[PDB]
Write an enzyme that holds these catalytic residues in place. Sequence first.
Site, PDB file in Angstrom:
ATOM      1  N   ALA A   8      22.733  49.811   1.153  1.00  0.00           N
ATOM      2  CA  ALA A   8      23.332  48.616   1.731  1.00  0.00           C
ATOM      3  C   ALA A   8      24.836  48.534   1.528  1.00  0.00           C
ATOM      4  O   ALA A   8      25.455  47.591   2.040  1.00  0.00           O
ATOM      5  CB  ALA A   8      22.660  47.363   1.153  1.00  0.00           C
ATOM      6  N   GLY A  10      26.930  50.943   2.568  1.00  0.00           N
ATOM      7  CA  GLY A  10      27.572  51.831   3.511  1.00  0.00           C
ATOM      8  C   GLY A  10      28.240  51.118   4.679  1.00  0.00           C
ATOM      9  O   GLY A  10      28.152  49.904   4.853  1.00  0.00           O
ATOM     10  N   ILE A  57      18.054  57.987  -4.265  1.00  0.00           N
ATOM     11  CA  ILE A  57      16.853  57.875  -3.442  1.00  0.00           C
ATOM     12  C   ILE A  57      15.973  59.113  -3.565  1.00  0.00           C
ATOM     13  O   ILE A  57      14.774  59.042  -3.277  1.00  0.00           O
ATOM     14  CB  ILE A  57      17.192  57.620  -1.957  1.00  0.00           C
ATOM     15  N   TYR A 164      23.664  69.060   7.804  1.00  0.00           N
ATOM     16  CA  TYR A 164      23.520  67.613   7.920  1.00  0.00           C
ATOM     17  C   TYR A 164      22.591  67.243   9.070  1.00  0.00           C
ATOM     18  O   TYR A 164      21.755  66.341   8.938  1.00  0.00           O
ATOM     19  CB  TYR A 164      24.879  66.923   8.099  1.00  0.00           C
ATOM     20  N   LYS A 168      18.843  65.101   8.860  1.00  0.00           N
ATOM     21  CA  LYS A 168      18.365  63.967   9.650  1.00  0.00           C
ATOM     22  C   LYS A 168      17.090  64.321  10.409  1.00  0.00           C
ATOM     23  O   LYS A 168      16.152  63.513  10.477  1.00  0.00           O
ATOM     24  CB  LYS A 168      19.461  63.512  10.610  1.00  0.00           C
TER      25      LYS A 168
END
Length: 342
Positions: A8, A10, A57, A164, A168
């Site tokens: 939260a 970011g 995380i 990256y 995702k």
Amino acid sequence: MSVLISGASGYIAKHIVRVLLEQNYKVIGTVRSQDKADKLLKQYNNPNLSYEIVPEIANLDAFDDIFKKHGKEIKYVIHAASPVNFGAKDLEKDLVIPAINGTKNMFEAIKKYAPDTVERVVMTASYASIMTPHRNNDPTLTLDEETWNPVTEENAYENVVTAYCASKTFAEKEAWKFVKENSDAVKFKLTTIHPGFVFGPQNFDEDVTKKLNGTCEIINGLLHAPFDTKVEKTHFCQFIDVRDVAKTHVLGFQKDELINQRLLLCNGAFSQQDIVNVFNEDFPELKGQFPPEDKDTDLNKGVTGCKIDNEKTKKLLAFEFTPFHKTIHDTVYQILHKEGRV
Ligand SMILES: NC(=O)c1ccc[n+]([C@@H]2O[C@H](COP(=O)([O-])OP(=O)(O)OC[C@H]3O[C@@H](n4cnc5c(N)ncnc54)[C@H](OP(=O)(O)O)[C@@H]3O)[C@@H](O)[C@H]2O)c1
């Protein structure tokens, strides 16, 4: 009726929290440290906002404590935490592992502690999980909401960009796998959001720093580049406005027609030079304090790379996306105004 949002602190998430608070939601954000929680609470100054600390995380069962405490009150989850910064020689540890494990941790905590209570999960994926990076410049490829980045785990780590994009892609694949395998055990419905390069102002003026983290440093770096800097005029990628992204995340758990949808959030191609051209057109009094205008760009020659078929996304969301020129203008104005230059 509370909304939980991971990551939260970011750039995108701070806008999402703004939108949630505009609509009177009770919001629980997760951030890495008490420092960041304390700063954010002071920035929003809103009693509907609170934070829980999730330092990593990727670590075992990282979201369990939140649902042991709040499981009964969390109706909607926005899973926005995934690494954007990372060590270039730690591509698994800093990138792919936290992307995937953070997603597994969030979904497994819901299943374990609130399988019948959480109604919707909105996950920030990326244009990166739809597009093929090495075909970014190929106009014979058309991408839509059902297209997947075909990167393999074997070939994912060609460079930091493919790695990256694979983080995702692999995290989103695991998300849909979970929802398929648990459709009977857990009630929640998944929506994924797939932004291109995200530009637009920081949610708070005070967070405009000399060097920005993340994608807006593309703009900020060009804005402060010496006049004689070589600027690329070839296609770079698709963009989307951060405020469109934030609005879409909140619609994502509100609108029944967004259930089980992948939402492709791109609104136009650009080169570095197309960004610089906005500096010169919109702030002519500062010409010479950044690189000059040049209308010879891929975009202006009708060259935009792989094609975006997101008509379904635009129809489902219904609201008009923010045009490139405004997104760049608003980003630049916030910086220059903070610097006392306009
Ligand atoms: N162009 C874009 O910016 C773009 C485009 C498509 C998708 N996305 C996705 O949007 C989401 C937010 O991106 P952003 O641009 O807003 O970048 P950001 O400002 O760096 O936000 C990332 C957020 O996730 C947290 N985070 C990352 N890794 C974490 C970890 N291992 N453990 C705990 N927290 C972690 C970060 O916390 P800390 O800062 O404390 O580490 C931060 O709060 C990500 O999922 C990103 O992949 C971004």
